[PDB]
Every structure is written in structure tokens, then in C-alpha cells.
Enzyme design. Structure first.
Site, PDB file in Angstrom:
ATOM      1  N   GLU A 154      23.569 -18.073  53.834  1.00  0.00           N
ATOM      2  CA  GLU A 154      22.137 -18.331  53.766  1.00  0.00           C
ATOM      3  C   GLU A 154      21.304 -17.504  54.735  1.00  0.00           C
ATOM      4  O   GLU A 154      20.096 -17.375  54.521  1.00  0.00           O
ATOM      5  CB  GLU A 154      21.847 -19.820  54.021  1.00  0.00           C
ATOM      6  CG  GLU A 154      22.589 -20.777  53.095  1.00  0.00           C
ATOM      7  CD  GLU A 154      21.938 -20.906  51.730  1.00  0.00           C
ATOM      8  OE1 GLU A 154      20.870 -20.296  51.519  1.00  0.00           O
ATOM      9  OE2 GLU A 154      22.497 -21.618  50.867  1.00  0.00           O
ATOM     10  N   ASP A 165      12.697 -17.235  48.132  1.00  0.00           N
ATOM     11  CA  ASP A 165      14.102 -17.115  47.782  1.00  0.00           C
ATOM     12  C   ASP A 165      14.264 -16.302  46.496  1.00  0.00           C
ATOM     13  O   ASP A 165      13.334 -15.629  46.036  1.00  0.00           O
ATOM     14  CB  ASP A 165      14.748 -18.501  47.673  1.00  0.00           C
ATOM     15  CG  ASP A 165      14.207 -19.326  46.513  1.00  0.00           C
ATOM     16  OD1 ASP A 165      13.288 -18.872  45.798  1.00  0.00           O
ATOM     17  OD2 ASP A 165      14.713 -20.451  46.317  1.00  0.00           O
TER      18      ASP A 165
END
Ligand SMILES: [N]C1=N[C]=NC2=C1N=[C]N2[C]1O[C]([C]OP(=O)(=O)OP(=O)(=O)[C]P(=O)(=O)O[C]2[C]([O])[C]([O])[C]([O])[C]([O])[C]2[O])[C]([O])[C]1[O]
EC number: 3.2.1.17
Length: 446
Positions: free
Chosen positions: A67, A76
Site C-alpha cells: 500500500e 487510488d
């Protein structure tokens, strides 16, 4: 700097040393970089280019790798607002909405900026939430309880990424995991939207499920090149050129020079002979669009291009653009100079998320099959195992000069190079083109 076998190169180095004594020092090619210098003779004429020479694995470190860490709000893959270690804020396109949700989670007005400790605090909460989602789910908990700790981390990773409901949907894969059918579950998990959306991460997680080890997370970021050995790569490229008589790499040797212009006592490095009148290949490729080469010169250019392909493929150059192979055009009417060969001889073939392609493979020329001229000239060498062995020994004598030499790492370099030579040998026999040559799956000779 003794070059008994090459008196011509030694005289060039002697001229370089004489110029230094009279104050004519090498100059940085670019003011920003201190790793490349133009060396001049006493007449201030450029003669050469000198280039001086406990981690714990767990769900937390697994997810930190997958991540990342951002202290400011970012979008994202789907464009959703995110911060910290993969903490989704909201699906709303409103940045203020994301800042509103962030402020509630942190306990203060952040305006979209948090600290590392606050990022870690959210990260611990999110991991605990993922574990809670697993334990409160009738399809995830039996799988979770039956798994070892490493495979449990992979399950937590999936629940972290896509949520409890999404992971619960993998009905058959979950059952295979519970039945310890690792290979079947690994194959089945790849046939998912999750894999297609994030293939590199899903491959790491699936490998963790398949093996129950951290191997997919251990050697990330290592690269395929031995550190701090570019000068040997520069010298090795000429050695490969010279043994094959390619005559496209300017003579390059490992030399020692002392200069006040260096960034600090002699400094070791690579010394490549300066070539004059060459332009970047991209320049001449552009010019040939309006003034295409006559067929006699086109054939000569293509044979030079084939030599470049052979050199780069054999040494598995990872840094060949169409700006760092040069072309001279007005014996040879048109000539190629293969320069800047400091990022070759990798100890392993690259992984496929960082391919390091040869940029000449994009060119239309690369689809031209290897000429019968180049095939008859090169096949007798590369098909001769005595020749290939002698080449490896020659590179060993050069590469072992460095302090950080490792026998196992060197033999890895030769296994890659031998594998490249094998594929090139078959490609030439098959009459393939440089474009087809680079499509062949990489092989090694153990
Ligand atoms: N034999 C030869 N005859 C004649 N002309 C030659 C020649 N050889 C080279 N030239 C010319 O001289 C230019 C630079 O030669 P070069 O090899 O590219 O040196 P270079 O230091 O790697 C550049 P750089 O900006 O990438 O420097 C970066 C750093 O800034 C850093 O960011 C990192 O990436 C790295 O440390 C480093 O690569 C080439 O284009 C050619 O016009």
C-alpha cells in the site's frame, strides 16, 4: 594504468596524464553529475570519456509494501481519495468530504495532511478491522482458523484491500485454502477481477497463499544489476565487442586517474575513447524520414544495427535508448557507436513489472531479418562453446578486479549471458529479426 597488450590505448592515457600535469583537467559532461568527464589531451582536444567508480515480515510489513505510505490525500487506482497506508477515506469525488472523513479519523483538523505516527495509528486500526471482518464472517473465519500465520496474513491482506464481502465472494478458493489445495487455490485466485486490476500485488498475495512463505516480499527493489560496477560493465561491453569483432563500442578500459575536478588519491573508472562526428540515432532516424538512405547505405546501416542488437542482447543491456547509440553519416559510409554501456551484465533476467526493454526494438528496422552477412559472421563464434567459455573467462578476469566481486553473483551473470547467447544463436539460425529475437522468453545456462 599498464596496457602492455594495447600500446595505442596506453599512449592515449599518457596524453591524458600529461594534460593533467599542465593543469588541463577533465570537465564534467553535465554540471549536475560528477560521474562522467570529458578527458582532454595537452592540446585541449577531448580524447576520452572517464566514469569514476533484521527486516521483520508480517501482515504490517506486507501491507506497507503493498500500500505504500502517503502523508497527504491522494487518489487510488479507481480515483478514490486515500491517505496513509491504504486507508480509504470516501468514494465521494469531493475533496472536502475526504478531508471531513479524515478529520474524524484523526481527531483534529488535518486539511488533508497527517503525520507518520498518525498514519501508523490508522494502519493498525485498519488491520484490526480487517481481522474483525474475517472473524465475524462465516466463510472467512473457518479458512482463517485453518491457515498458518503467513497464509493468514495473505487472507488479511485481501480483506484489507477489497473488504470482507469481496473476499467472502471467493467461495471455491476459500474452500480450497481450507482444504490446503494451495496450487488449485492459487490458480483459481488469479482468474479474478482483483488480479486483473492489481496484478503485481495479487501475484505477491497469491504466491504467499501458494507457498506459505514471504518469498514474494523478500527481494523487492534489489534490481538486476550489481551495485557500483558500471565501470566494469563499460569495459565488459568492449571486451564482448572485441572478441566478436563487432567494432561498434569505442575502446573502453578500466583506468586510474587523479584530478582536482573529481568529487572527493587516484580514482578507478572506465575510460572510453571519444568518437567525433556522431549524432544520436534518434536524430538520424528522424532525418531518414525525409531523405531515406540509398540501398547500399541502408544495407550498411542495417548490418551496423544488427551488430548493436547482438552486443546489447548478449550483454543484456538494461539502459539502451535511441539516444545513447550514436550514428555518424556524411570503409564505412555510415557507422554506429555503442556508447554508455555501464548498465549491462545483469546477474539475473529482469522481472516483468520492470522489463528494461531495448528501445531499438520499437524501431521499424528491428523487424528486418538478420542479414546472411551478420549470421555467417557471428554464428561461428557464438555456436562455439570453446569461444563462449573463453569469453566468460575473459569477463571473469575483468570482473574479479573489483573488491565486491562474488563468485556466485558472477556465475549468475554468465548464466544470463550464456542464455542470451543461446537465444541469439537460435534466432540467427532461424533467420529471425531483432524484433523477434527480443520476444523469445529469457533462458539461462546453469
Ligand atoms: N565515447 C563517446 N564518444 C563521444 N561522445 C560520447 C561518448 N560517450 C558519451 N558521449 C557523449 O556524452 C554524453 C554523456 O555520456 P554518458 O555516457 O551518457 O554519461 P552519463 O553520466 O551517464 C549522462 P547522465 O545525464 O545520464 O548522468 C546521470 C546522472 O545525472 C544521474 O542522474 C544518473 O542517472 C547516473 O549517475 C548518470 O547516468 C552522451 O550523451 C554523448 O553525447
Amino acid at each position: 594504468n599498464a596496457f602492455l597488450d594495447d600500446p595505442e590505448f596506453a599512449d592515449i592515457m599518457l596524453r591524458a596524464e600529461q594534460a593533467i600535469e599542465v593543469g588541463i583537467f577533465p570537465e564534467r559532461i553535465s554540471q549536475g553529475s560528477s560521474g562522467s568527464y570529458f578527458v582532454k589531451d595537452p592540446k585541449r582536444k577531448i580524447i576520452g570519456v572517464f566514469k569514476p567508480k533484521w527486516t521483520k515480515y508480517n501482515i504490517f510489513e506486507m501491507l506497507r509494501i503493498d500500500e505504500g505510505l502517503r502523508l497527504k490525500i491522494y487518489k487510488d487506482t479507481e480515483g478514490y481519495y486515500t491517505i496513509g497506508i491504504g486507508h480509504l477515506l470516501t468514494k465521494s469525488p469531493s475533496l472536502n468530504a475526504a478531508k471531513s472523513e479524515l478529520d474524524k479519523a484523526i481527531g483534529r483538523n488535518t486539511n488533508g495532511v497527517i503525520t507518520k505516527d498518525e498514519a501508523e495509528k490508522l494502519f493498525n486500526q485498519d488491520v484490526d478491522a480487517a481481522v474483525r471482518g474475517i472473524l465475524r464472517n462465516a466463510k472467512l473465519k473457518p479458512v482463517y482458523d485453518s491457515l498458518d500465520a503467513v497464509r493468514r496474513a495473505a487472507l488479511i491482506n485481501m480483506v484489507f484491500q477489497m473488504g470482507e464481502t469481496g473476499v467472502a465472494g471467493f467461495t471455491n478458493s476459500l474452500r480450497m485454502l481450507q482444504q490446503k489445495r494451495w496450487d488449485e487455490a492459487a490458480v483459481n485466485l488469479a482468474k479474478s477481477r482483483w488480479y486483473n486490476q492489481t496484478p503485481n500485488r495479487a501475484k505477491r498475495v497469491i504466491t504467499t497463499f501458494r507457498t506459505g512463505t514471504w518469498d514474494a516480499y523478500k527481494n523487492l527493489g534489489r534490481g538486476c544489476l550489481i551495485p557500483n560496477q558500471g565501470y566494469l560493465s563499460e569495459a565488459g561491453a568492449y571486451l564482448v565487442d572485441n572478441k566478436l569483432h563487432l567494432s561498434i563500442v569505442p575502446k573502453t578500459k578500466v583506468v586510474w586517474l587523479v584530478s582536482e575536478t573529481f568529487n572527493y588519491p587516484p580514482k578507478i573508472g572506465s575510460f572510453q575513447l571519444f568518437v567525433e562526428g556522431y549524432k544520436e540515432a534518434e536524430y538520424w532516424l528522424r532525418k531518414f524520414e525525409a531523405d531515406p538512405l540509398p540501398e547500399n547505405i541502408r544495407k550498411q546501416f542495417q548490418s551496423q544495427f544488427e551488430r548493436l542488437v547482438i552486443l546489447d542482447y548478449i550483454i543484456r543491456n538494461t539502459d539502451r535508448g535511441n539516444d545513447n547509440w550514436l550514428v555518424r553519416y556524411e570503409e564505412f559510409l555510415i557507422k554506429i557507436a555503442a556508447i554508455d554501456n555501464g548498465l549491462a551484465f545483469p546477474f539475473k533476467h529482469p522481472d516483468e513489472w520492470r522489463a528494461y526493454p531495448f528501445h531499438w526494438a520499437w524501431l521499424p528496422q528491428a523487424k528486418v531479418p538478420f542479414s546472411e552477412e551478420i549470421r555467417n559472421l557471428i554464428l561461428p563464434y557464438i555456436s562455439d562453446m570453446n569461444f563462449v567459455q573463453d569469453l566468460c573467462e575473459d569477463l571473469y578476469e575483468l570482473f574479479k578486479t573489483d573488491k565486491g566481486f562474488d563468485k556466485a553473483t558472477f556465475e549468475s551473470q554468465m548464466s544470463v549471458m550464456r542464455g542470451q547467447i543461446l537465444n541469439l544463436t537460435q534466432a540467427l539460425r532461424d533467420g529471425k529479426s531483432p524484433f523477434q529475437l527480443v520476444q523469445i522468453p529469457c533462458v539461462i545456462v546453469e
